[PDB]
Structure formats: structure tokens, C-alpha cells
């Protein structure tokens, strides 16, 4: 019965990310090389730059506990242990996902620039399939 | 894999923490009446004041879909469901609630009073038991 | 129908006051006698001061028609009555003690003060009993 | 053994309105919707501007409270249960209606225009009813 | 869930039409024809004068097109026809004629002078039958 | 007949002394010696400092004619006597104590203070037993 949108500060509420398909972000793994091997200075020092890593720490660290959740269930239970692992993937997985790719896109390329890309492929996908360009993930520096 | 501590930027190391018992900190309810008897502005207006409450919603959020998950496993799942709820309140209990007791402890008393407190606690409890003041939480604005 | 909040603009919401318990207020005759024996000219003479007691007259004067109903239902009415005396000690004593013990108390060491006392009750009682200090209502001018 | 008049900080003791007759009062519907509808900013929001409406809201509370004594003796309750409610609409009625009828109207043409009003109904009810013309309320901006 | 009415940019939320009995509003055919006898260049022309007409338009349309399904369900529907048609007008004629009334009474007359008619006409009706001077609608430019 | 109030004039009425217990007050060879300790020089040299110990001079002479009316009712009168001993001791014990309690009290501390302690003690002792600090008589110069 708490209903509070993480998207606020930086403007974007989460009903502007529904309209990104679910298999658009990249997998898991791929996003938290990009955050280290981008990011290790800002992560580890304690200097404040910004509320994205800010952010993307207890992100992680939720994420961390979901997996230690899961090397938990993998160890000490009993079948009944894979479908568990398979619902966090497919549950948590998506919101975990969005915030990490939101947070490493708006570091990289600017926090102004990702809106104009979200507004934009909202309008592509509110097209019907009968005639649509090509659109592919274009962002420029 | 690696490991980040969240509580650092404001001081206050993990290990700082480590003083306090485990029992010492109260119960989610109390916690979450508290942050909303206290704060229903900073949770919902899109003003930013500080990375305190910043984090607190993706604590609030993390929180969240536990309780969901809990819920799922509560009305799909099979004797094996009390143990993981019993599980992740003792050991996931814990580790939320310290994110949501420093937040709400540091900004109403302030986030520099707050460390002293912990230094003070840390002394109170090494002394031995032969004679000790019988402390309690000293927290005046 | 709609609800309103008496405690409003002096700060403290009521869920502030959901903080202390029940039984904390102290009884309707001893805040009736702190009343007069403090205060003989506020509720008597017409000059305006703050509308503590501008409020704490209407309070007074519900309490005291319900005090008339009480012996209505007495004189008049016929195992039916104590019930109901009972039940009106139990509902509208809480009820009205509480507009009552909030007018004196910030009368004396002023609206601002009682504020925090509000807030350092509610931390003293949310903390676990297993390590808490013996508090007492600490209120000095 | 307390004896406060509320109407002494705007003057027109108790003794005034005693003039006006119990009827001529309309019923307590009105007067809250009349309350609501013209007054639903200064009863919500904390902005004070006079004690008027700061009395109000404690007026319309012990109304509340009544009526939810009402409700509980006529679900939780045993004939006896219609003779109290009756009572407490002429007993308690006539006070509650006297409290709402004079602080909207001198809200709306100023405590200082009803004053003179009063004044004037007194000696119109005084005079033997062997002549007296056809008097009406009349007030106006 | 949405919740929005449309007195707001003119002021005068609809708790304030809520004074005014329902019946006191005239048919649906005199506010038609009154409309396209004195507006007729500002329904057509596309000058712009004030949101007053601009949002009477689609009002109108609203209202034709609940005719038009009106008329499809009589023409098209088997008793249970009548009682729909009697329905609409019960329940949504009594909202159309609202928008229609305030937005041709406040072109005429003015937006200002409409605002304290409401009141007057409101705390009118509420005194006493046993006093009350006789009022009609007085609207002068 | 007529009854006046001899604490007056220094604020402290006589409401305010009814707080305070009947068997706080410490019994009246402490204060004899307490009084005579500390003063020596005002009670015996003719310079007046305050009226104080002006009234502190009555009340001790009043005390000397009370034990020596003791003495007569020992030495002359004949199970008669340790009822009136005892009735003195419970009836006029409580109030000498009073006077000289106050009195000394308000001499080393001053006047002003005293006041607060009075409010204090009263606050302290108002609330139920289910959570009150453990109280003792806190004066300091």
C-alpha cells in the first residue's frame, strides 16, 4: 500500500518505461560488466557526483542478495528450487534491468538525451505493424 | 564476486554498524510508520533534498517485491513455505532494516550527531559487565 | 463522511498522537484541576490570547454535556446504564483527554517544545525492550 | 461546577442568543453543507485566519462523536435505542446548531453586522404580540 | 482511476452546484435553443473568444452522440428500450444541463456576477420556512 | 468567616501547594535545624532582607506557643492527652511544615525558582503509574 514511482527526480515516470519491450534490455551480465568496467572510480570512492550511482549501489546490492537468495535455495533446500530461481529472473529480473540500464545510459550519453530517445520510440511503437521503419537503439554522444 | 559498502559517503563504514546487536533494531512496522508519519512530502514530491531519501525508495522498493514474492510463494507454492518465509524475515529482515534505520536517524537528528551515537553505543557495550550505566537510544534535536 | 484533523496548524498530525498509547493520558480530573489552578483568567476573562484556549472552552464544554447526559440516562432511564457509562469513559475519555492534555501541555512549555517530545517518545517506545531506558515525561520550562 | 461562556471574545454573551426561538434555527444538514460548500479551503488547509473556523472544526467534531454514539447504540445496543437518540437531538441539537449558525453567519457579513441583528430581534420579541409587524431574517452584505 | 471535474479553471467546483436542488435546472430543449439563438457565430465561426464556448462544443457533441445511441438502441433493441432512454436522461441529462447552464449563464451575465448568486441563492434556501423573503433567479446585466 | 491566602504575593497559590503530598514534606526537626544552620544572623540581627523570613518569625513563634500549650496539657491535664498531642502533630504538622517549608526553600534557591519545581513536581506525579520516571527533588543553585 506504498505506490512511489523511482523515476521522479529525473522526470521519465515508470509509466514511460512500459512501452520499452521486455527482451529489449540486454541480459544481466552484460550490464553489470558495462557498470564496472566504466564505472570502477565512482562505485568504490566515496566522492558524490550524482544520485544515478548513488542509486545503482543498494541496486546492486539487491540484486546481490537475490543471487545469495538463490545460492541459498540452491544449497540448503530440497524441483521445487528451479522453478523459484526461474520466477526471479522473470520477476525481478525486468525491474532490476531497467534500473540499471537507465541509470548506465544516462551517465554515458546525459540524462537530457534518453528522454527525447524514450519519447521517441514510444511514438514508433504506437504505430501499427503495417508501416514502420526499421528502428534499431540510436543514441549518439 | 566483489562487494561495495552503501552506508559510505556518509562515513560510517559497515564496520561501524557491526557494533550494534542484531536484535537491537525494531521491527519493519515501526520503521515504516515512522518514514510516513514523518515524511508522505520528500517520498512523493519529485523534490530532491539529499541521497538519503533517494535511497530509501529503492529500499522501500527491494522491500516491496519481497513481500510480493512472499505473496506468490504463500498462494502458488506447496510444510516448504514457512521455513522461506521464516528464512528471509532473519535474514533478509536484518540487513533491510539497517538501510531504513540510519535513513530516517540521520535526517531527523542529522547525519553528523547520528556517528557519535554509534561511537558512544560501541564504548557502552566492550565495557564489561562488572559495572555498566544501563544506556538507552540518547537522541535529542 | 469527511474527516478532519483538529491538531492541524500547530504542526502534529494525528498520527503523530497514534504514537503514544492509550493509557499514557493521565485522568480527566487531574487535567481539569492542572486547568483551573493554572489558568482562572483565560477561560473566564474575554481577552484573547491563542486559540489554545479558545478551543479548550468548546472541549470543556462537550465534556460537561456529556456529563449531563450521563445523569439524564441516570435519573431517568432504568443493568442498561453502567454499560454505557462505561463505554463513553472508554471511547470519548480517550477521545477528549486528548485535546485536553495537548492544549495545557503546550500552554506552558510552548508549541514548539512539545514537538520533539513527541517525536523522542515515539523513538523510545519503538526500540526494542531488550536494551531501552527507563523514560519519564521530561518537560521543563 | 464550570461556568464559561463560549461568546465573550466576540461578544454577545449566552444570555443574547437565549432571545432567538429553538425552532427558528434550520436543521443541522444545512448547516454543514452550507459549511462545506463555501467553506472547504479554510477548514482543510492549515492557514489560520480567525478563531471562527478554528472553533468550528471541534463544533463539528463533538457533532461526530455524537453521531457515532448514535450509530453504536443503534447497532450494538438493545425502544431504549430511538428514546436517547431522540433526546440527544433536542438536547445537545439546539446547542450545536447555535455554535454553527453563528460562526458562518458572521463569516459571510462580518461579526459585527450580526451583532446588530441580534440586538434588533430582541425588541421585536419583546413587544406583545398585540402589534408587531411581520419580522424575517434579514441580513445582507 | 481518474478523477477530474471541470469547474476549476472558471473556479467554482461542482460541491458548489451541489447547493442548487436538481430540479431547479430547466429542460434540455430551452438551453438548446437559447443557445443557438444568442450564440450562433460563436458555435460556427472558429474566433476565439473565451474556454466558455470552446468547451460548450464538445458538450453538444457529448449530448448528440448519447442521442445518436439513443436512437440506435430503440431502432435496434427489442420494455427494457424505454427504461434506458429514461435512465440517461435521470442520470445523465442532470450532468449535461449543468455544464450547459453555468457556461450560458456566465456569458451573458458574466462569470463574475453568476459566483454570488450561487451563494445567495444556496444560503437561501437553507433558512427556515417560517422566514424566508421571497427570491427568484435574479440575474441583470 | 472569610479566609485568606498567605502564599500569595510571591505567586504560588494555595492550589498549587495541594499538589504536593501531605507526607513529602520532611518532618520539623529537619527544618528547625536546616533553619538554623543556615541562618543564624537573619533571625536574630534586626536587618530586613525580604519578608521571608519576617513570616518565618511568626510561624516559629506560633510553633513555640503550640509545643508549649503541649507542655501545660502534659504537665496539668490528666488517656486524654496523646489523642490531642497526636491530633496537633497530623492537623497543624501538615501545615507549619508548609509555611517553613516554602519559606527556606525559596531563601537558598529563590523565589523564581521554586515556581517551576511546584509545575514540575505536578506534571511528574499527574501521570498513571504505567510509565513515569523515577522522581526526586532536583534543586541546584
Redesign the interface.
Known sequence: Y?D?D?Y??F?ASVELLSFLPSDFFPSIRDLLDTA?ALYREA??S???CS?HH??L??????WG?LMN?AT??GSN??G?REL?VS??NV??GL?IRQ?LWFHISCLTFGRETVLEYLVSFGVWIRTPPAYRPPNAPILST
Open positions: 506504498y512511489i523511482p521522479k527526480e522526470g564496472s562505485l568504490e566515496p566522492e558524490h544520485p548513488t542509486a549501489r543498494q541496486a546492486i546490492l539487491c542478495e537468495l541459498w535455495v533446500l530440497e521445487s523459484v520466477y526471479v520477476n525481478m525491474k534500473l
